[PDB]
């Protein structure tokens, strides 16, 4: 009985309350789920090509503004004139510009050199960036085939190749596939096989931050389990430098003097930044490393401002308050903000007033104001991603970067409040009781204002166990070319010589699960960090360290040509047969298929250790009597495993003796029939 | 409390059920809410304006 319904009533509490707790946490993970940063990515002005090099740039206060590029074939002679109003002339005499955006790898991807020539550098500098951000995460880039992974890349139309009405001489049809912001996300989704929503956003100087905002929305609603968020402004032709001189907004030195009295223009720089975004639960469940956590982000427009280019104050306050409100955080929870800091004499005052309004009005500690453009320059559509890169690197190193050219704080901004502290010196930012939080603001010339809130990664990674083992896990590394293989050995050797003390099994595990299986494979089983570094330097020079190169070309549209003529050396053993699921399934299927007419089993010959079978070895072309049945069984198994292990084949044919062999993998057989 | 055994805790049923209904309705209005087409503006070939 139920004590006159007391059990029934209270038990219905115990389900309704539990369901409410589940549904409200579903509200929380569906509206304010803290999405984490898995890997970092950047090709920023100067020598920056990796996030660690960008931190080396920020920590020592180096400015990337050096000068105009010369690899691009720029005229550079009509680009300037004593008359500031001359058509065809720019005003800034430099700016931080990429020295490697001119070059791209066609052969690495499924791109022809003819195609890659017409590819917009912005897109070329997203294919490589997506690859390298996937590697850095410990996630094999080729393992994300036909998987939900949204792409959000911000760009700037500008102009790169010839007129599309006039076409070209070598490039005719792939000029579309290059000079379109559209395919600047579709390419990445296609080469990497990503099935997630491929959106290429375009919101001027805030495109990257907008893209990360949308990626946050996609993950919070759950449309894509993974998100590809980033932005870029490659600088192919000097036209936009010429015409941003026409309204007299470019700083003649090309430097972003953010919040400085010497701000004589907002300058300009070209760069690229990219992020991996996804919900923290999916991170810590899947084991993906968490660099930082992006809690809340808002996107708004300036409205009817003093023109399309002029910023708005109230709209900026609204966006940087709405980001906090949607993040569940506030002005007092942010220890250091990353403002736009475009560098113009007009945007900076209103921007700092907005910062003082949303944050400075109620501050317990002075807010540390910083600007990545001071060290880099205004990266336009790559601004907002560079800011979050700077803040996440400050998280991971526990130090606030300097804001260059900010010693003389702007006289047009009221700093007497003291709630905002300009980051003219490196301020330590150690982990403490307060969760370290940062904010990135980007205000595009289109008027779209965006702001995001970056909380430190929850320090739950600590607690890892330590042990030792005799397992000499092979250091497997693969590339798309022999020179790429030699360079992948050399860079790994340089990393292990500049970052010593990394345990060999950790290195092997990172090289194995996180580096894709590329069609040029060199591997070795190290015993010591010296014997491993010697092998790495040997592969770098190009000698035979194991005499083993796993060669191939592609995986898509594979036709399974089946030539015989002797292969499939008997070199299997215990555990090996049970490492691959489809491999073992096919071997056991071939085992169980022949009951009535055959009784010999290949598994005892396979699972037998081959360390003792290497002293009487012979070539596979003269042992056809014994090798051929093994050829047939292992050929069935290997065809079945290579059908789906990262390969999307198109058909199967037979070059020689692989005809009935691939007919038996077409079905239409029984026990007796297959045996016969 | 007074007769039977449930006139203070059934109120807890009522409040919890209302809250759960309002939360699931929030779920369906944030992920399944119909979005109305207020008006339509087009410029299309053939003189369509």
């Amino acid at each position, epitope marked *: 009985m*139920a*004590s006159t319904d007391s059990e029934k009533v209270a038990e*219905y509490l*115990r389900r309704a309350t539990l369901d409410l707790r589940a549904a409200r946490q579903r509200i929380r993970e569906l509206e304010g789920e803290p999405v984490a940063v898995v890997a970092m990515a950047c090709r920023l002005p100067g020598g920056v090509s990796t996030p660690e090099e960008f931190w080396e740039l920020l920590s020592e206060g180096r400015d990337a503004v050096a000068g105009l590029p010369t690899d691009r074939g720029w005229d550079l002679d009509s680009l300037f004139h004593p008359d500031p109003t001359r058509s065809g002339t720019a005003h800034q005499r430099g700016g931080g510009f990429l020295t490697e955006a001119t070059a791209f790898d066609p052969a690495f991807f499924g791109m022809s050199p003819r195609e890659a020539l017409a590819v917009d550098p912005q897109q070329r500098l997203m294919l490589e960036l997506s690859w390298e951000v996937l590697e850095r995460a410990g996630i094999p880039p080729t393992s994300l085939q036909a998987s939900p992974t949204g792409v959000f890349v911000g760009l700037i139309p500008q102009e790169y190749g010839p007129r599309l009405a006039e076409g070209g001489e070598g490039v005719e049809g792939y000029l579309m596939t290059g000079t379109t912001t559209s395919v600047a996300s579709g390419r990445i989704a296609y080469t990497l096989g990503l099935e997630g929503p491929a959106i290429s956003v375009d919101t001027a100087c805030s495109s990257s931050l907008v893209a990360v905002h949308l990626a946050c929305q996609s993950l919070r609603r759950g449309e894509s389990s993974l998100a590809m968020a980033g932005g870029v402004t490659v600088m192919p032709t000097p036209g936009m430098l010429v015409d941003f001189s026409r309204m007299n907004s470019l700083a003649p030195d090309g430097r972003c003097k953010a919040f400085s009295a010497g701000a004589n223009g907002f300058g300009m720089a070209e760069g690229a930044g990219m992020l991996l975004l996804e919900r923290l639960s999916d991170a810590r469940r899947n084991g993906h490393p968490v660099l930082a956590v992006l809690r809340g982000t808002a996107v708004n427009s300036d409205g009817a401002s003093n023109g399309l280019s002029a910023p708005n104050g109230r709209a900026q306050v609204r966006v940087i308050q709405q980001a906090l409100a949607e993040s569940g955080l506030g002005p007092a929870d942010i220890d250091a903000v990353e403002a736009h800091g475009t560098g113009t004499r007009l945007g900076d005052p209103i921007e700092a007033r907005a910062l003082f309004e949303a944050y400075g009005r109620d501050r317990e500690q002075p807010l540390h104001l910083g600007s990545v453009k001071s060290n880099l320059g205004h990266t336009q559509a790559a601004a907002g991603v560079a800011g979050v890169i700077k803040m996440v690197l400050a998280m991971r190193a526990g130090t606030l970067p300097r804001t260059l050219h900010a010693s003389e704080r702007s006289k047009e901004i009221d700093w007497s409040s003291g709630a905002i502290s300009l980051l003219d010196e490196p301020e330590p930012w150690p982990a403490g009781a307060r969760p370290r939080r940062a904010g990135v603001s980007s205000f595009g010339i289109s008027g779209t204002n965006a702001h995001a809130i970056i909380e430190e990664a929850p320090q739950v990674v600590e607690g890892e166990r330590v042990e030792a083992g005799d397992v000499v896990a092979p250091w497997v590394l693969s590339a798309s070319s022999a020179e790429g293989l030699r360079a992948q050995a050399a860079r790994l050797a340089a990393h292990l010589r500049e970052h010593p003390g990394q345990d060999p099994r950790d290195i092997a595990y990172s090289l194995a699960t996180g580096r894709a299986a590329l069609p040029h494979r060199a591997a070795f089983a190290p015993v010591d960090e010296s014997a491993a570094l010697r092998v790495l330097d040997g592969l770098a020079t190009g000698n035979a360290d194991g005499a083993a190169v796993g060669t191939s070309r592609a995986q898509q549209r594979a036709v399974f040509v089946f030539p015989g003529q002797g292969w499939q050396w008997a070199g299997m053993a215990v555990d090996l047969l049970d490492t691959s699921p489809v491999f073992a399934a096919a071997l056991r299927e071939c085992a169980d298929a022949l009951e009535p007419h055959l009784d010999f089993e290949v598994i005892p010959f396979l699972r037998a250790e081959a360390a003792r079978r290497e002293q009487d070895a012979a070539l596979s072309t003269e042992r056809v009597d014994v090798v051929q049945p093994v050829m047939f069984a292992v050929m069935v198994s290997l065809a079945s495993m290579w059908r789906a292990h990262g390969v999307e084949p198109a058909a199967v044919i037979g070059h020689s003796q692989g005809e009935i062999a691939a007919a038996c993998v077409a079905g239409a057989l029984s026990l007796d029939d297959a045996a016969r | 409390m007074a007769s039977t055994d449930s006139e203070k805790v059934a109120e807890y049923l009522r409040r919890a*059920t209302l809250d759960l209904r309002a939360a699931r309705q929030r779920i369906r209005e944030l992920e399944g809410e119909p979005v109305a087409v207020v008006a339509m503006a087009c410029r299309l070939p053939g003189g369509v304006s």
Partner: antibody
Amino acid sequence: EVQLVQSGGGLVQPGRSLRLSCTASGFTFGDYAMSWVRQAPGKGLEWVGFIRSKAYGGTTEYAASVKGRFTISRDDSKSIAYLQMNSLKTEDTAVYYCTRGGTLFDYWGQGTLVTVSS
Amino acid sequence: DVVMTQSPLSLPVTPGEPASISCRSSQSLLHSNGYNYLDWYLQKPGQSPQLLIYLGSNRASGVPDRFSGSGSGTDFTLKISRVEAEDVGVYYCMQSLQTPRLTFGPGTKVDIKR
């Protein structure tokens, strides 16, 4: 999360005892009242009995067909539920379920084959 | 006396169509608290069942919101908006006004319409 995983399946003949244990993890065990249901093979479930929570205290109900045969006990420190078979007969040949509530069987374990065959 | 509860049995459902299962009660299951005391369960063929609806209309968590239900003081209706390939099994219209609950009802083994 939650799991009321069971254990104690086996093959017995009528007239002896059998063990059924329900592992509780992911929640406070003394808050929910354990119940046990039996599923005859190929046809509908037919309930067995339940025990009330310690804070409530209460008593134990069993089905009219298991009076004086089956008993249920519970504990918080080890958080394992107990369904006891004594003097088994043929009708007990069925898969039993561990249910998470006296009247709301809001969670259900996988089920263990309790077979009493001759 | 014991409440006589017999849902209409044998409701085949084919994927992509709206179905609806009713249920019977001898006397009213609507208590003085204004709430119904009948529960809705679906028996997996092959493993454990799960909860669809309690209070007669209040749905449980975990299961999708497709399992909608309502009812009058006596008449009840687990009114299932649609079914799919996995929505096949045995639905139990169990009451909760009179402990013991005992059997879960003969049960509504439901299948694919054809």
